[PDB]
Symmetry: D2
Subunit: 123 residues, 4 copies
């Protein structure tokens, strides 16, 4: 975990994020897009649970990205919840929730759900 989390990760769609896993569970870094209403890099912040594991279990973690930077403001934010598995072919398996700001009437259709798998190699 931590040392093994730190670095660059890529997902199937081509997205890329670099993250630093700090000693006390913090995750900080940037997410650069590859396919949605995003354009360039965005700040990401999250946490991981720093004392994961005598039974080769994954390390739970999560992070958020608000889709606002100096070139674009999509009025939306995505959170990824998942776990890190290390080794030869280390990966971060996640499910994500993307919420867009809506008026009260359209709130029922504000959140999309999906999944993403990240690898250290692309892809």
């Amino acid at each position: 975990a931590e040392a093994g989390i730190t670095g660059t990760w890529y997902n199937q769609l081509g997205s890329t994020f670099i993250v630093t896993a700090g000693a006390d569970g913090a995750l900080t870094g940037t997410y650069e897009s590859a396919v949605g209403n995003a354009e360039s890099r965005y700040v990401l912040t999250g946490r991981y649970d720093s004392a994961p594991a005598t039974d080769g279990s994954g390390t739970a973690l999560g992070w958020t990205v608000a889709w606002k930077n100096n070139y674009r403001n999509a009025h939306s934010a995505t959170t990824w919840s998942g776990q890190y598995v290390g080794g030869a072919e280390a990966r971060i398996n996640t499910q994500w929730l993307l919420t867009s700001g809506t008026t009260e009437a359209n709130a029922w259709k504000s959140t999309l759900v999906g999944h993403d798998t990240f690898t250290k190699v692309k892809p």
Copy 2:
């Protein structure tokens, strides 16, 4: 948003979190539990999209909490994705994903999904 987000929020189950919404989209604070395998306060970090809105839309945001502190380590993390609506009865409506670290075989059952509504009054 931001100023209106800053403060103490409570949900139906009794959970409480205090958050500070910084000028450039950051969210920092603590989450204290009221009903799960959590015990005390945990650090939370997230982001909100700081330039939300000529059509009274909500402000999208998200945050993460790794369930590890000095009294407990649940080997899990939760992410909340949702939006903030201000006014008389301001609230944060969210959907959440809670992932626990599992072995590769139990990964299919690692993530729970639910929703939470937070108010400035309890409840």
Copy 3:
């Protein structure tokens, strides 16, 4: 369960569905809309698990509605997964997934997630 499930149910948004819970776990009925890209009644089908419970637990169930009828074809389908709780104030608490048919490129944004609570009284 079963006998207690059979009947008319209403949710917060105003939707209404009538369902018949058959002896061997079947659920059949119609869903009439109150607020989305639906107009009139749609067929619903699902199942419930018919032998639920010495510890007052809910009865798990789920059903699907394809948003196609003789007046509208939204090219989408919704599934509701949840449980039935009986008694004085019986209810069906669910989380739902609504998928729209997309081209392969927009598949990442094809599914919305939400929740609905149904009561025998409106609301």
Copy 4:
């Protein structure tokens, strides 16, 4: 869609389901397990939206399985929401919700979320 949906499908985990897509949007069939608290075949029922598509879009559909049969009763039900894509390498991409019946206190942790991809070839 329909004719193309009818048949046997397999997912990564080894699960198998045979389904018949009827003329008016019905889906009927069985699901046989390969990896969870299921043992043998279970009845499945669902719907698909029968008039999908001049822009090669997927066909939205969904189905439910209550995990009760003559050998096992898991007191749970799963719903799969997704779309069918045909062609050379036809597939059904879905996200699923699995709800277990709980007491009112544990209801917050009753639903798991995941995804499954089915192919006509195994896998």
